[PDB]
Amino acid sequence: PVDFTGYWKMLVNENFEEYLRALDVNVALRKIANLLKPDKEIVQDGDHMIIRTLSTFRNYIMDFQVGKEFEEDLTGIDDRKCMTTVSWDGDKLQCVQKGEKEGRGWTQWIEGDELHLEMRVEGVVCKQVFKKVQHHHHH
Numbered sequence: 001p002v003d004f005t006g007y008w009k010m011l012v013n014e015n016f017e018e019y020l021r022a023l024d025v026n027v028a029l030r031k032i033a034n035l036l037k038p039d040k041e042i043v044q045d046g047d048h049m050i051i052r053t054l055s056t057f058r059n060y061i062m063d064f065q066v067g068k069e070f071e072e073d074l075t076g077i078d079d080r081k082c083m084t085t086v087s088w089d090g091d092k093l094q095c096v097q098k099g100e101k102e103g104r105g106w107t108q109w110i111e112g113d114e115l116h117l118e119m120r121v122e123g124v125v126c127k128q129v130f131k132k133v134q135h136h137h138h139h
């Protein structure tokens with residue numbers, strides 16, 4: 001069984017500017033966000049999953065029950081809210097974010113020491129890869 005618990009450091013962030021543009025993030029804020037290399041701190045506790053995206057600019061925290069649709073507040077990302085469901089798809093974790101934007105969601109999986117995160121909106125695809133790490137720092 002797949003367990004995402006751990007601390008993960010960003011290695012690559014591919015096509016993030018177009019993903020942000022598709023979310024209508026303003027130009028000045030895209031400049032800031034494109035420089036960020038956030039960590040992921042994940043705790044999988046039964047079906048309760050916490051995914052913290054940690055950066056020097058701000059943190060974005062997801063805290064949900066797998067399988068249960070919830071109102072996700074993305075105010076700090078693109079000023080939207082979505083009805084979001086995160087579910088298992090075999091060994092992958094799928095997120096569908098229903099809202100104003102078509103085809104918004106993400107897929108997360110592990111390969112070896114890598115956390116893979118593919119983020120999608122309106123036919124744009126952004127791919128991030130993080131490496132599992134062990135030196136922890138307070139947040």
Ligand SMILES: COc1ccc(S(=O)(=O)N2CCC(O)(CO)CC2)c2c1CCCC2
Nearest residue numbers: 029033038053055058059060076077106119
């Ligand atoms: C404008 O500032 C942002 C825009 C997008 C992202 S982000 O795309 O890395 N981010 C994590 C993945 C997801 O949760 C997927 O829905 C969206 C939010 C983030 C920020 C600022 C701080 C942390 C991350």
